Design a protein around this ligand. Structure first.
Ligand SMILES: Nc1ncnc2c1ncn2[C@@H]1O[C@H](COP(=O)(O)OP(=O)(O)O)[C@@H](O)[C@H]1O
Ligand SMILES: [Mg+2]
Ligand code: NA
Ligand code: NA
Lengths: 94, 383
């Protein structure tokens, strides 16, 4: 069993591809050692502009290219992947 | 918006692929070729890239540039740069500690950094994908040899930036090939992969361990001065003697005739991978004299006997540096255009005791293939 994987699995399924729900709680699943991501509150996630702005930020942190050869590589890609699907689904809305 | 591509930016030939509609397409250039010479020709009027560049080399040797990948991310006074310079007909100079390619372009002397020269090749591969997609290309994954360091990686990225590309990632050539076969999508225990990459100028053996989609380069081996070009040269000398016997003329000293012979030998060589003989046909090779001749696969194989069989020492070397036995590697994958040579494939397979080789993806395309797969996932366009 992989505890850091299990927490990301649980985060993913609890938020039901809600881009805002994921973005607003991503700091609770980042690896220990992660220092760049300042937590976002719903208040900065209201407009589509806001959500666009923050998702681009989140995607940079967990990007698979940077995470290559890192002990958290697998988890970064788990998050990145869910972020992309949440965002594509956010963009289907309308 | 528009798709991202994979570009194999190669020492001798470049290749571009796009992952679209569930499939990777390796994209043909406007002359019908799925790979493109990493060649840049400067003339009085134009700048030529690829097939057009390589085809006029015989006429324009001093302003036709190749092997920029050998200069990329290096300092002028690097021992590798100083030895490599001997082979090249174009000039290489020192700008403040950095290597520059100096050529005559439009009746004015111009010099270019390695990453600038590679940008021109990357630009052409960009255009190849844009002609095919009917839309502009910005995002790319570009590949680089596993043994590349951070200077060579950064410089390769910069060549992307100079080409108008947003480089999503720089990834290893062996890794991209394993990805091309979807080896990184296997689950379970750690698998060992061996990459047997024999191209036009470089020979690379890499062993990777893949577990849960995560790569580790265990060991690398090879010869940075061993590839198809050398097999070409064996044939070239073979026929220089033959032309001397039939005609009492020696062409060794005529740059133009020797190159013209290399081009015919290279074409002949490719034929020998699928057929058992090939004919050579050159109009007015030297001092008015038409050269026409024949060459069997057997004759080709034996002209190259030593070079072919010595290909296995780097296998053994990488195998021991990895601390693994022959039996312990799960996948062998053929990469590089020269692995289409039947005798190389038997040679490798017999070393592994008959074990089947991963070769269904064209070996000179497997790198760009894997880069294209990666570009797609990096863009959120795959699974
Ligand atoms: N069918 C073939 N048989 C033998 N050699 C081939 C064949 N096709 C391509 N090659 C050789 O492969 C080399 C180029 O390999 P490639 O992998 O495309 O480039 P690079 O070495 O730049 O990665 C050239 O020497 C070319 O002559
Ligand atoms: Mg190659
Ligand atoms: Na290549
Ligand atoms: Na190679």
């Amino acid at each position: 069993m992989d505890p850091e994987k299990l927490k990301i699995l649980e985060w993913i399924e609890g938020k039901e591809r809600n881009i805002r729900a994921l973005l607003s709680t991503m700091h609770t699943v980042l690896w220990a050692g992660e220092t760049k991501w300042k937590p976002v509150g719903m208040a900065d996630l209201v407009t589509p502009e806001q959500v666009k702005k923050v998702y681009r930020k989140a995607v940079l942190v967990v990007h698979p290219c940077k995470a290559t050869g890192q002990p958290y590589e697998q988890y970064a890609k788990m998050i990145f992947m869910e972020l992309n699907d949440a965002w594509s689904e956010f963009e289907n809305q309308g | 918006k528009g798709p991202a591509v994979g570009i194999d930016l190669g020492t001798t030939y470049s290749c571009v692929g796009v992952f679209q509609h569930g499939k990777v397409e390796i994209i043909a250039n406007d002359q019908g070729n799925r790979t493109t010479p990493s060649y840049v020709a400067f003339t009085d009027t134009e700048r030529l890239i690829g097939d057009a560049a390589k085809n006029q080399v015989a006429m324009n040797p001093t302003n036709t540039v190749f092997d920029a990948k050998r200069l990329i991310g290096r300092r002028f006074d690097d021992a590798v740069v100083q030895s490599d310079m001997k082979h090249w007909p174009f000039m290489v100079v020192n700008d403040a500690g950095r290597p520059k390619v100096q050529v005559e372009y439009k009746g004015e002397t111009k010099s270019f950094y390695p990453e600038e020269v590679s940008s021109m090749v990357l630009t052409k591969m960009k255009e190849i994908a844009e002609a095919y997609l009917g839309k502009t290309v910005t995002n790319a994954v570009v590949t680089v040899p596993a043994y590349f360091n951070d200077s060579q990686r950064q410089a390769t990225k910069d060549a992307g930036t100079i080409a108008g590309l947003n480089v999503l990632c720089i990834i290893n050539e062996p890794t991209a090939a394993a990805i091309a076969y979807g080896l990184d999508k296997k689950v379970g225990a750690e698998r060992n992969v061996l990459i047997f990459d024999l191209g036009g100028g470089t020979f690379d053996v890499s062993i990777l361990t893949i577990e849960d989609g995560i790569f580790e380069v265990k060991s690398t081996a090879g010869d940075t001065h061993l590839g198809g070009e050398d097999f070409d040269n064996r044939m070239v000398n073979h026929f220089i003697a033959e032309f001397k016997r039939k005609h009492k003329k020696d062409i060794s000293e005529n740059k133009r005739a020797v190159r013209r012979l290399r081009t015919a030998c290279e074409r002949a060589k490719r034929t020998l991978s699928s057929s058992t003989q090939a004919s050579i046909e050159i109009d007015s090779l030297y001092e008015g004299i038409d050269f026409y001749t024949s060459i069997t696969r057997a004759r080709f194989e034996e002209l190259n006997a030593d070079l072919f069989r010595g290909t296995l020492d780097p296998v053994e070397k990488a195998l021991r540096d990895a601390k693994l036995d022959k039996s312990q590697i799960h996948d062998i994958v053929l990469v590089g255009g020269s692995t289409r040579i039947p005798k190389i494939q038997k040679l490798l397979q017999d070393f592994f005791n008959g074990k089947e080789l991963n070769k269904s993806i064209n070996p000179d395309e497997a790198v760009a293939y894997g880069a294209a797969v990666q570009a797609a996932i990096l863009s959120g366009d795959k699974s």
